[PDB]
Design a binder for these strands. Structure first.
Ligand code: MG
Ligand code: MG
Ligand code: MG
Lengths: 72, 67, 233, 150, 159, 191, 199
RNA sequence: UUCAUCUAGACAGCCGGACGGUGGCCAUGGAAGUCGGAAUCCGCUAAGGAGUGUGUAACAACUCACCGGCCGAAUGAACUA
RNA sequence: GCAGUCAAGCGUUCAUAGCGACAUUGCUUUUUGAUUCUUCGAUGUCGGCUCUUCCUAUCAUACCGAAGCAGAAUUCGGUAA
């Protein structure tokens, strides 16, 4: 296969039939899944997960404050 | 061809239910519920048996099938 | 932390209006009834902004209020012992839909015969019945969907097949390069209850078989302090 | 351990000066919010509708104590009118009515620790800007009641 | 049908070569002649040069009756009446200059039949807002501030 | 907070009967008879009139209160199954190798045989559960219909028929083959 | 990371083998012709820059293996106004010792007339150093080339007068003359490569 | 604990609107709210962004922000331990 | 590690006494993959033979997840001794 071919196959044939509902249900399950990983993970992976969660929360609150201050 | 649900019948703690007192100064005598304080505590009064007006736990009495 | 649902993330430019807009609409309705003598209660139910910015343009002389219905009834004081005029409780209890208040001063038969005219076309009438029966053929589907000429149309885009199948229950494949459903499937028919699926299919195939026409409930003159009923459907 | 004892002295000094600045700031806040009737009978250069007659003998000060007590009746009336039907009232409403009744009971016993208004206390009050030591030197803070003052 | 005379608007730079690379998917399947169409498009928009313009084309039995539709982008810029901005040189053509209130009122009186405002004041305010987008000064003023002054009654615009 | 009393309500239609003795529910209707064993919930059922059942919890916590609505939904799905039925439709797609799906009887047990999925020599066998009926819908290409009274049995049979043929060690943005559920509805789709 | 992800998909051109290069204006022509002579995935679509890259096809003539490289298209521009998309094509022509086919549309489904075609062909005349150049009129079932004018035949003779040219005509959609064009190009290149043995 | 919203109908859900100068100005082979830099205005509004995402070569279509109908009682955020 | 800009908590309600998590730039080029024939090693009381168990912080074998993962071959993760 030549120059970029997966998106040409997508445009020519389509994706799977059950593709979209699986992605929607995955995004719906992620909210339950991120709390299960905060409680089950032990050792070093728990510390790494907590560091990533703190970084994401600070980044999101910074984005909210910057958006409201810049628009108003 | 009617539906059939049996499943239960219970004595209810409510105002007017008469009550046998099982332990304390006034054991063996009847009183009535006059007010409900919480899930576990009520206000009772029986004048004819000679038990004063008082608050008690429901664990110190037993409900009778009389109201 | 307790298990609760968190709201979805949206960072946009508009903000939510409050009771001040309802108060300004109430004051405007009372002052407009005090200024204009020909308050007409109409029922503009299903209408596109394009058609209203046209009627507001034709009757560019009068005033039109299209606020919330309970707030407008409170401004006209729908209580039986409350009013801002003489016996407006009939015109207040007449309002039972997405109501409109056309406060005019000019006429009393002209403003009830022109309306009987303005009646352009509309969408597929999701609650009422449809007339033009459409059945797509057994070939590649197109944008007008058997409503244009042979080679004067565009074939339907590939990014709508999933909405066509998993949101309108129409059997489809792709199988060469385009939509190309295998059989011929009739969407709607004449004189039947058009469903929400049939109306959305007729809107996506871009048909216009129903007509929109104004329906005026009543019109009250404040000079005589009296409301005349009408049924200009 | 990489702390020894100098780190412990350092954290002790910082935590101590932090805690002491906090408690000092809290005490000055308590004193400023305690000495509010004094600033009320101080304001408008001792009620500037009567800035000419510098006497205020025994009924004017009673009226001023009553006005200081009922100075907040407008918010209470507005909260009664805005209080919805099937709703418990607000914490502002409960605490403001608490302030109301707990001032009125003190009024019924002995009104308010106010100025004496029978000596040079009026001159010292007009020349008593904001310091807490007007009580320390020249207060004459003899109290009155809702009747014959005594 | 009898006719397919639909307004095939084709916003394309005027007094230039309206290449049918952008018109073949809408005309060259409907049996036209692209060179005759390009010459007719040039002859229709043979007034505005080095500035794009909207243009229709009554398709009446393989005879492209071309026409120019009026908009507050050309008239506004054409009013500005600047020099040429080529693609063969430094193309950074900032439209920093000054317009006239008389030309603004003339453009409003021209395209008053393409607006939902029944007042020439509101139409001129919308036109000054379009000029504030197009970075053209009007009476040496920031156009949004001058329109705010006009909404607070600065200009005397007869209807 | 341990709420004092919480109740949910079940509206039972005309031609159906329900019998609940010790948390064992039996629904008899125009299409058959379903049963359920709810002896792990600690609720109380009560018949109001011959058209309303009421289920209740007394002095329950949050975790206990969260099960009243699942009890109500399970019994309502029993009623909906016995008066309308459940119909699932599954469509199967392939790129090169046509999938052959048939109904077989191996010692009298009603299996679905799937063969030639992606050119495999392996035969996949999935057993029909008790009460679900499998039909092959003419006038639609490459479709199967599963029908029954029990939504749990019909959905579980469609689920393991989906999961028996999955793509292994390939790229699923490229290899678009298999069986998928396309519609969940009713046997009597209206009225 | 981005350049690795892009460079992994890139086609495999051997610069030292039998090669037919195709070239022309941005309307399909070339991609439809490559679809006819080979098997590929280059879709044919009536808008201009459908192929924003270059594609390879393979075929077999007289028991040899031939490549065929498709071209995005050179717009109109002199030397430094071009994008990297046109840079790809002119570097392919400048570097690939091949047999180049030039496609002409005498009908006007494209947006560029015959005068602009011949002007661009005379502009990229010196780009051919040691290559067999050959011109091809496409879609002749709508515009037959003998049904021309004397105001067209002049510049047609101007693209005829070069020492390397062979004016042929093709109707790639209707499947009229494609095998003969491919055989003619392969014959020209095979003779020009075999006569340079020099051992 | 502190802020808010709510019978002038709050939160969740279904359904309808989501307009007009204008395909704002540069860049682009083409990018019309959605590859980028500039930008950020005006009218009509009950309300509607020179646009929150999905999308098309570019258009279309859908969604969101924001308003309206139906249903009818309290609900949402941040924080403390 | 040093230097600077931040900015949620802060100095148990003070932002700029005085802290200050998450960030962010600077400083360390034979600065266009160049040079560097180098093992710039560590190690002095242990090393080898024989033989048996245990840990998991998983190299291989078993089963899964993600990736521009076409196929083939890999990379990064999860369970697992
Ligand atoms: Mg492990
Ligand atoms: Mg592989
Ligand atoms: Mg072992």
């Amino acid at each position: 296969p030549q120059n970029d071919y997966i998106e040409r196959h997508i445009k020519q044939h389509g994706k799977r039939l059950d593709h979209e509902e699986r992605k929607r249900k995955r995004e719906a399950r992620e909210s339950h899944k991120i709390s299960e990983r905060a409680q089950k993970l032990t050792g070093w992976k728990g510390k790494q997960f907590a560091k990533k969660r703190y970084a994401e929360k600070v980044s999101m609150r910074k984005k909210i404050k910057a958006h409201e201050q810049s628009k108003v | 061809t009617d539906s059939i649900v049996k499943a239960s019948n219970w004595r209810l703690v409510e105002v007017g239910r008469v009550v046998l007192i099982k332990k304390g100064q006034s054991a063996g005598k009847l009183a009535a519920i006059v007010e409900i304080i919480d899930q576990k505590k009520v206000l009772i009064d029986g004048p004819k048996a000679g038990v004063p007006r008082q608050a008690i736990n429901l664990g110190q009495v037993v409900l009778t099938p009389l109201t | 932390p307790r298990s609760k649902r968190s709201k979805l993330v949206t960072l946009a430019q508009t903000d939510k209006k409050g009771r001040e807009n309802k108060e300004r609409i109430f004051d405007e309705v009372r002052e407009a009834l005090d200024t204009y003598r020909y308050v007409w209660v109409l029922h503009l139910d299903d209408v596109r902004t394009p058609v209203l910015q046209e009627i507001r343009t034709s009757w560019a002389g009068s005033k039109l209020i299209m606020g919330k219905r309970k707030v407008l009834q409170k401004a006209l004081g729908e209580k039986r012992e409350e009013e801002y005029k003489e016996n407006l409780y009939q015109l207040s209890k007449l309002c039972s839909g997405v109501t409109g208040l056309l406060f005019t001063d000019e006429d009393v038969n002209t403003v009830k015969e022109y309306f009987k005219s303005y009646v352009r076309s509309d969408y597929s009438r999701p609650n009422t019945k449809a007339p033009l029966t459409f059945t797509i053929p057994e070939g590649i589907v197109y944008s007008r969907g058997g409503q244009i000429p042979a080679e004067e149309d565009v074939p339907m885009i590939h990014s709508l097949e999933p909405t066509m199948r998993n949101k309108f229950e129409i059997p489809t494949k792709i199988k060469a390069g385009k939509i190309t459903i295998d059989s011929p499937y009739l969407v709607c028919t004449e004189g039947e209850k058009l469903d929400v699926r049939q109306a959305l299919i007729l809107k996506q195939f871009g048909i216009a078989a129903s007509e929109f026409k104004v329906k005026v409930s009543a019109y009250y003159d404040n000079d005589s302090s009296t409301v005349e009923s009408t049924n200009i459907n | 351990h990489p702390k020894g004892r100098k780190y412990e002295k350092l954290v002790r000094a910082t935590m101590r000066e932090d805690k002491i600045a906090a408690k000092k700031k809290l005490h000055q806040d308590k004193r400023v919010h305690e000495l509010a009737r004094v600033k009320f009978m101080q304001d408008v250069v001792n009620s500037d509708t009567f800035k000419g007659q510098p006497i205020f003998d025994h009924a004017h000060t009673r009226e001023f104590i009553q006005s200081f007590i009922e100075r907040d009746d407008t918010e209470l009336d507005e909260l009664k009118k805005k209080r919805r039907s099937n709703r418990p009232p607000s914490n502002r409403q409960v605490l403001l009515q608490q302030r109301r009744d707990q001032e009125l009971k003190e009024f019924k016993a002995g009104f308010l620790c106010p100025d004496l208004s029978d000596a040079k206390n009026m001159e010292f009050l007009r020349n008593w800007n904001g310091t807490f030591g007007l009580l320390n030197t020249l207060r004459l803070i003899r109290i009155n009641d809702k009747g014959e003052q005594v | 049908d009898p006719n397919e005379v639909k307004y095939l608007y084709l916003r394309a730079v005027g007094g230039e070569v309206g290449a049918s690379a952008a018109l073949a998917p809408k005309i060259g399947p409907l049996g036209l002649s692209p060179k005759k169409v390009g010459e007719d498009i040039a002859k229709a928009t043979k007034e505005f040069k080095g500035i794009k313009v909207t243009v229709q084309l009554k398709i009446q039995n393989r005879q492209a009756a071309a026409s120019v539709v009026p908009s507050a982008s050309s008239l506004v810029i054409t009013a500005l009446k600047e020099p040429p901005r080529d693609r063969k040189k430094d193309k950074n053509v900032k439209h920093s200059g000054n317009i006239q209130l008389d030309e603004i009122i003339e453009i409003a009186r021209q395209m008053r039949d393409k607006s939902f405002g029944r007042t020439l004041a509101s139409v001129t305010k919308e036109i000054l807002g379009t000029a504030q987008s197009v970075g053209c000064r009007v009476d040496f003023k920031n156009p949004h501030d001058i329109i705010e002054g006009i909404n607070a009654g600065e200009i005397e615009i007869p209807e | 907070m341990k709420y004092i009393q919480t109740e949910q309500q079940i509206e039972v239609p005309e031609g159906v009967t329900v019998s609940i003795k010790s948390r064992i529910v039996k629904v008899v209707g125009p299409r058959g008879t379903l049963t359920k064993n709810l002896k792990h919930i600690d609720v109380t059922f009560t018949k109001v009139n011959n058209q309303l059942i009421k289920v209740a919890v007394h002095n329950g916590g949050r975790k206990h209160v969260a099960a009243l609505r699942t009890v109500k939904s399970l019994v309502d799905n029993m009623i909906t199954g016995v008066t309308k039925g459940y119909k699932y439709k599954m469509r199967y797609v392939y790129a090169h190798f046509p999938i052959n799906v048939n109904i077989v009887e191996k010692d009298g047990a009603k299996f679905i045989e799937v063969r030639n999925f992606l050119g495999d020599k392996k035969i996949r066998n999935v057993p029909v559960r008790d009460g679900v009926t499998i039909e092959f819908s003419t006038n639609v290409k490459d479709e199967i219909v599963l029908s029954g009274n029990s939504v749990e049995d019909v959905s579980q049979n469609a689920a393991d028929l989906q999961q028996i043929c999955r793509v292994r060690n390939k790229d699923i943005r490229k290899f678009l083959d298999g069986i998928y559920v396309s519609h969940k509805g009713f046997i009597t789709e209206d009225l | 990371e981005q350049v690795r992800q892009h460079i992994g998909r890139l086609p495999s051109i051997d610069p030292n083998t039998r090669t037919l290069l195709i070239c022309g204006y941005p309307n399909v022509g070339k991609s439809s012709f490559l679809r006819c002579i080979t098997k590929s995935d280059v879709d044919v679509q009536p808008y201009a820059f459908t192929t924003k890259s270059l594609y390879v096809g393979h075929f077999d003539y007289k028991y040899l293996r031939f490549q065929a490289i498709d071209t995005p298209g050179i717009l109109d521009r002199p030397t430094e106004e071009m994008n990297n998309i046109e840079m790809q094509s002119i570097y392919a022509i400048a570097h690939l010792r091949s047999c180049v086919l030039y496609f002409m549309d005498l009908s006007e489904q494209c947006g560029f007339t015959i005068e602009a075609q011949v002007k661009l062909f005379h502009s990229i005349k010196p780009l051919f150093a040691n290559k067999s150049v050959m011109v091809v009129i496409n879609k002749t079932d709508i515009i037959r080339p003998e049904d021309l004018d004397e105001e067209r035949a002049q510049l047609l003779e101007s693209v005829k007068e070069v020492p390397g040219v062979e004016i042929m005509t093709s109707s790639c959609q209707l499947e009229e003359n494609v095998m003969e064009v491919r055989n003619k190009a392969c014959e020209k290149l095979l003779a020009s490569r075999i006569e340079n043995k020099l051992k």
